[PDB]
Amino acid sequence: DFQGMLEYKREDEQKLVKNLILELKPRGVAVNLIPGLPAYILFMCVRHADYLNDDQKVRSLLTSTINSIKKVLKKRGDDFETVSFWLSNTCRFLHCLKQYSGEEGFMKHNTSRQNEHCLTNFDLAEYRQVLSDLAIQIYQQLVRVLENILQPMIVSGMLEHETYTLDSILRQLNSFHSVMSQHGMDPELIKQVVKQMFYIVGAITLNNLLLRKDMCSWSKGMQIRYNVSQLEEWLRDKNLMNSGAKETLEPLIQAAQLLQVKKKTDDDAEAICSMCNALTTAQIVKVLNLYTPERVSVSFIRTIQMRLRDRKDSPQLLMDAKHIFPVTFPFNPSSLALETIQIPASLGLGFIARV
């Protein structure tokens, strides 16, 4: 029987964070079989340092950990797998520091056995803050890499197509989601990533439509709306209907509808004004101007602008495609028993011992 700790010699610490963080591959047999494993192992090391009441060793490990993680994300921050992996694991490390902090609040989902594994000599509340802030940092490098990959596909797949296609986009979305899943990234974190990906698709598409006269036709309205419904299906097939992802596409949807509605009578104008609640006046006017069949008369456009004067949001045309919804990492306790964790030989951590 073990207590669920890991001891290591102090001069071995640089070897520890080297194999466990610096040179640990985001894709491996052990990490794939047991997602979050490096976070669990790091936490078990902290437990024993705490159990030793060695503040200089606790400080050393906690410092090396964040330094090494940052060292990794600097060296390979262009790589989606690496970023996704260390986001997922930094998070799990944060959860572990909470779930076994010895604070009653973070202990409402623990077994009796788990509650025995709490820290006893040190309060790492200040460290958790640094770590959570590091996580926020990581989450944004993620969206950064995420966007640079999606971006060169969006116009082509969503618009210029009767390079990439629509299925290319769905494919890339399928790739992103599976990678995050395999890393054991919190489901609620995945949701926010998906919402962020749909917004980028929507914002880039709408902006390109608004800056191009060749894209504003009834035909494209038929095509855009079809493409959106393929993205809705993608959410529905992964139970992401409550991710808030769909709602971020509302401006694009309404712009696509606007291209299809009749645009001649006073009633047509009235209907447009109540339908397009998610588009700005500038956006509605721009689409009406670019339309290509009769053409939208200058007085029909005037009727629209006059009618919409009830709205006091300053006139804006372009969506911010670099906008990032503020990320939350809600506490997610694991039911994993630390006492039955072994150290797979492929991690190259033979120099540490279970306690």
Binding site: N32, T340, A345, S346
Partner: protein, 82 residues
């Protein structure tokens, strides 16, 4: 997710295929709960997959290096024949 991996001929597995198999076996093990003998089996399966990874990796690297060498040697021999 491993349908294509498991269905492959062993001599044509890549290390990526092994990683894929590892994930889905991991899920199925995880879905069996916290029984301590499930966990012992889990780490035993980790070892098996590790051995599988190594043999796949070694074989691919050795075959690849020998292929280059062999191709280069065949070009040298051809010249020396003329």
């Amino acid at each position: 997710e491993d349908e294509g991996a498991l269905a492959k001929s062993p001599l044509q597995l890549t290390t990526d295929d092994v990683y894929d198999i590892s994930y889905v076996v991991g899920r199925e093990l995880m879905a069996l709960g916290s029984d301590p003998r499930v966990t012992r089996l889990q780490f035993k399966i980790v070892r098996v997959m590790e051995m599988l990874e190594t043999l796949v990796n070694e074989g691919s690297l050795a075959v690849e290096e020998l292929r280059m060498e062999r191709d280069n040697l065949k070009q040298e021999v051809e010249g020396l024949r003329k």
